[PDB]
Amino acid sequence: SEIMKYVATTCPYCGVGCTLNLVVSNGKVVGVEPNQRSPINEGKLCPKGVTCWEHIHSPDRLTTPLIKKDGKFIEASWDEALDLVAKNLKVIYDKHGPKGLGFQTSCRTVNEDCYIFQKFARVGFKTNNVDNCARICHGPSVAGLSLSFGSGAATNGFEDALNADLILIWGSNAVEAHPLAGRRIAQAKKKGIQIIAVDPRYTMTARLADTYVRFNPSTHIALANSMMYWIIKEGLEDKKFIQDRVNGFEDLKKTVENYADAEAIHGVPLDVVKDIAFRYAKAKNAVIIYCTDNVRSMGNLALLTGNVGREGVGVNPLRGQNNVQGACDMGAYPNVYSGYQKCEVAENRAKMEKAWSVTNLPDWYGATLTEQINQCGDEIKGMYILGLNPVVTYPSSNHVKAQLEKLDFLVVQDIFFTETCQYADVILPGACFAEKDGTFTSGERRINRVRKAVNPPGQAKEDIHIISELAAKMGFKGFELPTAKDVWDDMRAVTPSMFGATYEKLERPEGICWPCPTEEHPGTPILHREKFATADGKGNLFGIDYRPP
Template identity: 50%
Template structure:
């Protein structure tokens, strides 16, 4: 997030939500947004193929067709430029590349977008005006934007919209991706990506590599590694012989589960480190028992870049150990001695190598976390990014063109399947489905279908149906609701016995981020 969660509750005058079911997937942030709307009069724009809860509070709701994000955003930009609602001073002083984007979006009229996106042109115009006319307007998005074969372009389009209106670098504004799990931001910060060291220091840059080689006493590769999806493909092809999987359940969370299973079965050796015997751990040659958040010390970095202390509340059971201890012991047995004595000692190494964390210490975050970048111990942290200038100097506009999703409906598969989460279960259900009260409330998977779509197939609420794509089929209950667009169906991936990711498309990847297209697949449905 460029801004803080507090901004969404107290500062933002307009909040544009796109591709985020905020109250279900980020309940605390969803509550704060709701408070801003109800108590301070903030205006909401909601763009989502499903009528999420916050759509009921929105000034305008845009139920756009899955995969048409760029068409919608470019059309909003078209309106803002045409009606002279842009921030000319911000564009002139702080950005570059605007003219090329202006030329591109000229053809993205609201009328064209209405035909492609399936929303009224007048609503697109209304949304553009509300966003552009506000002094402080924030954009929030989540995986509904990124999990596409053009997810990177979707994000670029959002950034274009924010810069066009000067909604960067000031309170109540910004581009705010909402992280889906408690330490996703921290994992990325620590180099849990294939192309960077901690602090997003690129592996190809010799200066970065030399610094970490000196600190760690080893020679490091000079090229980036593989993403998770690429690693699974490489395992299937026999290029990767062994995998070490920590706290991840790709048998349910990755697209085209049959493809994943075949890849894991092709490995010579699989290690899984987790707190429960997940569907993935069940396939492992060795399972290393880790511990939950309540059984270990350390830090989490949340969605607003706030580094916070985590403290052990209970002792681990049996032979389970904190992840850092397991990794140290494995590395030592492999011939690379790692003798850290505590998470704090590890954090001190992080500070020494990661400029954005340099000023954060355990003592400073004893009671309240600090938002990076924090370059020294006198620095208070950074609630708002890009206040004076962007990291690269001037913000760069990127012209992005709309293109269709990789897999579109046809006669054989006439519907669009989109996937996500619900309020009651978390990710692959590894923890929540072991909680009896939660599982009793939401014990099985469902597929949401619009009444008119259901009528076409003779399906009634509660019927068992077969949902199919080119990857396979699952059986689940039908839930008839007007909260989903006609011609679109929605289901979740929490349930192993009816896993949505048996159906999603592993072959359609974003060319930059290599994220699969979870949010659009051609599908069909039939009553059983």
């Protein structure tokens, strides 16, 4: 057939979204090659990207559906397994309404599968009990940055920090995780850019920094409060910015004026505090790289120094999962439909109803991952898990196992036989990133294409196909979407932003950044261009008091 064919794809291992070539010989992925054309990484990959191809053709991959029949799983046909799932979901619905079910997907999955998953969870039985890894993962920082600015995403890109004078890494292992985001720090120091690292431990990304600052762990609020106190005290705040685009300054004033001497809390001497504070406030264009109160303090700093809406500046919280941003965008949260359209507002609730040809959408705040797992027997019973391994990921794994065994009809879709699989009643095999054909979304809001290299191992299918077949079994209208392009077009019709991100535009190696409202718009690589995304269009900066644990 084919000998050494190159297929361009996105790396599935973190939020940088590096591009790579998979080498496919006789329908087998046999290696990973650089793609020098990519703007994100210029053909450069970390160890994970270099060896992403190893797990694709493992013998352990699930090949056919499995059904727990009075013990060990026996081999089932697709029709059999799907009819079983449809029957059990139907009965649990008809007995316990929409509260009885529970959905959660992984951030490993492509945008089209996250969107169709949340569409399945809402168009059919109307439940907002949909969620994903981002809760239990490191950062609920999206909510905090949303409160500060309006969009919880990173304000600027990665190439953008090359334009600053004062990259300020803060508590980030940006070279251990996101190494090709830390490549920007390496390039910047080669260009001679002031770099200040502030992690509690001397990490390999703190080696690159001109100044390194220890502080006692769990004291970010105190340290940032001190820095803002000195900025206010010597008046290096940005008056036009604060008076024009920011609100809450008096509250910040009261809250911070109690942090003149905080050496007791954080270990940083007042001399070093003044040094970093004045370097940051004096830098004309300074970018913060972060990795709830902790992220709102960063928003406080950026708003206080007027470092937001411009090239070479901003706040860039690093995500960590390959498609966590994409899942949140597609609307795999309890409270947002898609593109962060809140379900609390009847306006877009009715817009969803009209677009999806369904009625009486829930509008109540769903149950997050831990909410579901804790109430996994009390009112929730019946659970579809799209790619999670909760027994290995959640803390108190034994409690997780107890709750899952308290559960009626778990369904698990995975590419491998995990530990959570033993507790499933049905196991639907899935496809990995080399067999899907969707899109990922980087941490810098960039939509990248994933391309099909090989076929799923045996009888395994990809998630859009599985969910469409299940919805056709259960009699649900609106899941007639045979391709990732059709799923994407349905999503685009639904969402106001991302309306310009057609696949003919995503076939560009550059990709598209998420606020792309029209088809001629080139994208929005820098957010909050001259107005924010809150009610008055003005960022709010809050006063946080440090709580000792």
